[PDB]
Amino acid sequence: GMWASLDALWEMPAEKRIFGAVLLFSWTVYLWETFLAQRQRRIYKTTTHVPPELGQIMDSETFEKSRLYQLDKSTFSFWSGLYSETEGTLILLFGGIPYLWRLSGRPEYEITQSLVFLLLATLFSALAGLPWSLYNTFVIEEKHGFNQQTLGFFMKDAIKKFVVTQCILLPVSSLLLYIIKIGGDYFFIYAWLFTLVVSLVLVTIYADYIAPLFDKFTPLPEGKLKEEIEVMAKSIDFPLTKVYVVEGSKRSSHSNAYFYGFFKNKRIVLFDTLLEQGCKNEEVLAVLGHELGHWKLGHTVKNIIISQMNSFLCFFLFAVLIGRKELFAAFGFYDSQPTLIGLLIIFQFIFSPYNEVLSFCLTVLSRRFEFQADAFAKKLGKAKDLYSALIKLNKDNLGFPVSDWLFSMWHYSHPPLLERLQALKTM
Template sequence: MSDISIAFIALIAVNFGIKLWLNFRQASHVARHCALVPVAFNDAITLEAHQKAAAYTLAKTRLANVGLVIDTSWLLLLSLGGGINLIYVAAAGLTGQPTGLLTGLCFLLALGVLSSIVDLPLSLYKQFVLEERFGFNRMTPGLFITDLLRNALVSLVIALPLLSLILWLLDLATPLSWLWAWMGWMAFNALLLFIYPVVIAPLFNKFTPMPESEHKQKLDALLSRCGFSAAGLFVMDGSRRSAHANAYFTGFGNNRRIVLFDTLISQLSPEQLEAVLAHEIGHYQRKHLQKRLVLMAGVSLVLLWTLFQLLNAPWFYADLGVDYANPATALALFSLTMPLCLLPLTPLSNALSRKHEYEADAYAAEHSNAQQLIAALVTMYRENAATLTPDAMYSLFHDSHPPAALRVQHLAQLQA
């Protein structure tokens, strides 16, 4: 076994150890603080609701540990275990071509299908056992299968042209192939962001314009006051699948819209809903989507350049257990191994996301009502069984939103 192979195994072990350690910290911290509701939430959340959130968090953490073992085993099986070789040989046998674009596409498609099959048992357990146990599941087996098939079809339609372009450009191996691949990747993402709200999302959920009412008029007045023009306010039938509630801002240009889950509307008062809407507008006004796109552009540029440098590096294939050196196997290996290297950067990404959440909260406090947003957040924490006492280190790596206590404290300071 080469030094690089040993280093690769060590990298996997370190990632596994860090993630397991973080999960252990989270479980221990939540369990230690489940007997008392944090003082800041005493008036709004009962001990029963707090303990339900703790039990839900512990159950999800245990499931995450199982998922971690499965994912790590799958990575080792595909790389050093020779799995990529077996899949590639099967793809080449199917196409009758030892190399080429068609063989590469078949290989990547087969790898994606097999990875989805590996993930399926845990997805089924999470949806129909864990979520059911805590009263959140509203999905039927039929809808689960329908979603699975639709996801597969949409992924196929999206992935085939993009992968074809990237594999073709990488196969050309010109000095600027990586740059052209990056430009294609960014153009594709811009197109996807534009069409997602009106083409892809409606394949899975029903989106209806918020019906006219006095409350709707107040929300429209808020939009006008904040200078936000969009395709409209839409209500999504999230209750078909889950009792969880949320709201989000999506799209750009003429397809820009704000989406409210029907479960959220049923849980919040009109004043609280207005504060949540102001928060979503804050993301738009502070240009958070554009900033994330710029960050993604920079990261993807570096990653594609790195992939291009590894294309003709024999050690990248041989020392990671792959016998076939070509753009398709390089892309697969890179996609499987790069998350291991990027783990230390996760807190930085989450820190930026949290900064954006604080900025959107500040915008909502200025243009709506901080106290109503606090009330809305507390209601969402309670109804979604979100833990109020996450471990700080775990939160750095896993939470894109600030912990409940810090977020409420920040809003209270803005109100003062």
Template sequence: MNAEQLKYLLIGLVVAGFLFDKWTSWLNVRQPVPPVPDTLRGHLSQEKLQESKNYQRTNYRFGLLTSGLSFLVTVACLQWGVFGWLDAWVSTGVAAPLWQSLLFFGILFLASDLLSLPFDYYHTFKIEADFGFNKTTKKTFVLDKLKGYALGIILGGGLLALLLWLINGLGSGFWWYFWAVAAFFMVLINLFYTSWILPLFNKLTPLEEGPLKKSILAYASSVGFSLDNVFVIDGSTRSTKANAFFSGMGKRKKVVLYDTLIAQHTTEELTAVLAHEIGHYKKKHILQSMVISVLQIGVMLFVLSLFVNSETISLALGGERVAVHLNLIGFVLLFSPISTLLGIGMNMLSRKNEFEADRYAKETYAAKPLAEGLKTLSVKTLTQINPHPLHVFVNYSHPPLMQRLEQLEN
């Protein structure tokens, strides 16, 4: 395959990926507003269901605009060789290949973020605000962006620089070394995310003494789960949406509850949510996901090593020479169908794990409070109760609400 043929293959992959994503989203948004199910009658009204559909349609149309713009820009850059032009420009002012690549990606990152910034602002302060979710102030929005840039430069830029240095120094043999670094980094982030990164954006405080903490610790003790770290995060400073998550391993494991979750649920419901999270740990879902992710990265890096010095890819992107940064972009586009399939596979596994964690909570604590908690959470976040099956298959990491309730209530 010559460079011109490869260019149109890359464009075809971008077009196919965009159309597939929009098709599944379109099928989902066309789902009719159903009658309120019997099991939700005490929590949900027909008016609230209609509001949920309006929220879904609004986000679909907004996503169509933003992703459509990104799609057109990507296709234009491929068709008219913009990536190759940018490579030629950076190479005239910078001699070292490593710094050429870093400058190249830095310009692309800055241009992409500036393009998306107005849309991020509109989504936060218009769409989320219109539906009663937004609590973010303009100051917090700006600070979050600046902190995100800093983290992106330090962590993302550091890893990218190491990857490029290894490629320039070792050629196609780089992948073994960077795979080891990536695996170590993933473990490090899992262990220290709530200690090092999360506090940069949110305030974490230990759960205060009281009935909730007493109930949580009593349940954890009953299932042989040592738990000393239960924290509350100030999610209400940004949104009314609620969540809970589990982080870390061994002595560094932590349970984090959003303050909005605590405000919206009873002690029994919150304990059931914790039982679900402990179920993930007991069933080794966290370790399982970590191992699979590390293996996926290894496969991706090995495949990248086969293409990283390809002259054809560089030429297909409009370059006049072999450039590692051009080949990295070309590889991401070529690998996109495989990434989609891997993502679907991971979502299937995740949905299975969610059912298992629900079942663990049902067997070791109680089904009813978890079901009630899921109902309240879904109503508060305007969750769609009848998503299209194909959209679920492709995109959902959690089973739809009605499927989870069926398992819990039967």
């Protein structure tokens, strides 16, 4: 375990071998995902005719509208993905990150250098990706009539989100770096608990303060829908406070619905794109019954317990690997071993195989968690209304019913429409 790690090679290097290992993995994962992308792109180009099983789900006009849309999305997804994978590789090989660290110079001094390094890194991040983002909304989402955004709204929102990002990023990072540099030798427990507080605080704050800045939040008007939601909320013993209708129709024709809170103060959030055109009151309640299922089946609580179990395991292995000067020298840091750089190298590159496996396992769990929430909706009796809703929402978001099994197994957090509909038909 430790005696085998001290062995030296008279044929191969040490720091250079682990750096290449990072890039070799990053490219094999990319090539695996590109193979999967190619596999699913073939499905869109081959299946031009509507299947007999998916015949009642979408008509030939809606199916070809969905086919064209998913095809344009696949083409963009490749080139935008290829540019990113090339950029990451090139910045690493060219030695961007250490040189940027030198340029953000000239414990308080290191935290300041880290803070300005972060500010510049996210500035380049935002600007380099903005043309791709502008293309997706104004060419893909606009061609297939989803986008409702103007160039002004897109621009004003980009700055709004970028500013709010820094105002959260800068204080959290400066306080996080402080705990690692000051604390010890068990600094990882104090750093993990800080991120634990920051995570749960941002979860409750987001929809109540951060989210109403970018999108128009208004309380749901009193009616047949507003009354029936409260009846369902009291039935499941869900402590409902308020019901909101988000102006999602200002951005895109895409529908959404979720809940948020801490304990006795829970609130339901609906999109106007889901209520208007959208879904009928009977279908909306069934969609809510599914989302309320995640609350009742404790999917919400289980997902937090997994996320904090992952960060504990990560901060522990970080505390074990932060002392190793070999991983810093690998990426071009020879003169110093900075804390923020250590967080970047270990969490985003050394943990890359673990992070990829954990993500796959959580995607498998998410699919199982969705089926359980669909089974809960059937247990409420709204199985027939959810069956109709899932199809109507799929037609609204031009979702292709056919999908490559290997692609959906790896990527899809939600199981395929035909798989979800068959489970509801059986119930």
